[PDB]
């Protein structure tokens, strides 16, 4: 296969290795209790969190003081010295003596800066995820690592939210603690214009044999759909029902926000509907869940993935 090196970055199980829609691929202890947290190795271009039934956007600081959780955002609260949000130039200055950090690209640097803040002032491997906003070149550490809480049961005083690609998020990038320093080389970013993903068989690039066709008005809408259907580390819809009726809603909110591990069955390890061939002429997003291993030249197509930016082409 002459395509092996080129296509390696589309083997999302291998190169990313965790959920994309919801990335909760590892667990880590904080003060001796385990919590779920993001672990994907690739940046997720254009992902943010929509907070339902609230005007607050998710990069606002988590609620502190007398603020209710449902009225705040996900980000680090203000500190002294102020370490989140921090501009790219601010991070480079902060780490100017550390040759191992100060020249990282913006996304890895933001991931490493978030991973610098140990919540165990006394010991821990828990490392917050982060969002880098390309519009104002700011790294936001996310204090809340949850990404979806939107089931029918409570979604109220309830903090309800879901991950999405959205025009409002197109310059955001969702970063776990594990984002690799060479993601430009090994992870998707650009959509591939005039190209269709295929499978290499016996010296020829064949079509993906089974795809799931979702209509989509443009590439952005196709990327949004692939993201919605992609690898995910928690169920989209969570006698066990009788026992759920004894749970308290406010306690449940807290569990859904901080994610105490007290479920590897849920981990995708990157398996899912991570790819789509967008036919711009028929307005079909042809979505599939097996890794592609070659490209077909076809001027009607753009090849996208759940990790890819929703607009940029090459």
């Amino acid at each position: 296969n002459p395509w092996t090196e080129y296509m390696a970055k589309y083997d999302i199980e291998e190169v990313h290795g965790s959920g994309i829609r919801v990335d909760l691929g590892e667990d880590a202890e904080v003060a001796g209790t385990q919590y779920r947290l993001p672990s994907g190795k690739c940046p997720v271009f254009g992902k943010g969190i929509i907070i339902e039934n609230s005007n607050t956007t998710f990069l606002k600081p988590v609620a502190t003081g007398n603020q209710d959780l449902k009225d705040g955002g996900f980000a680090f609260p203000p500190t002294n010295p102020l370490i989140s949000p921090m501009t790219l130039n601010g991070m480079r200055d902060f780490y100017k003596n550390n040759e191992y950090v100060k020249n990282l690209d913006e996304l890895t640097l933001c991931s490493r800066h978030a991973g610098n803040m140990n919540p165990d002032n006394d010991k821990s491997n828990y490392k917050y995820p982060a969002v880098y906003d390309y519009n104002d070149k700011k790294c936001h550490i996310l204090y809340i690592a949850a990404q979806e809480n939107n089931g029918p049961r409570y979604c109220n005083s309830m903090f309800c939210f879901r991950p999405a690609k959205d025009k409002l998020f197109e310059n955001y990038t969702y970063l776990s603690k594990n984002v690799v320093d060479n993601w430009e080389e090994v992870c998707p970013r650009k959509n591939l214009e005039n190209a269709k993903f295929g499978l290499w068989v016996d010296g020829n690039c064949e079509d993906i044999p089974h795809v799931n066709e979702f209509s989509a008005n443009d590439l952005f809408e196709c990327n949004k759909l692939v993201f919605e259907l992609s690898a995910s580390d928690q169920p989209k819809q969570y006698y066990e029902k009788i026992k759920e009726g004894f749970k308290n809603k406010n306690a449940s909110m807290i569990k859904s926000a901080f994610l105490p591990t007290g479920a590897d069955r849920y981990k995708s390890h990157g398996k899912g509907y991570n790819w789509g061939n967008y036919n711009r002429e028929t307005q079909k997003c042809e979505i599939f869940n097996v890794k592609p291993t070659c490209l077909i030249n076809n001027s009607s197509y753009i090849a996208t993935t759940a990790l890819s930016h929703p607009i940029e082409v090459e």
Binding site: T79, I83, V101, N118, P119, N121
Partner: peptide, 13 residues
Amino acid sequence: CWTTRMSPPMQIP
């Protein structure tokens, strides 16, 4: 509430 992991270690409350 946080302590930096990379030197120089620092309290950031």
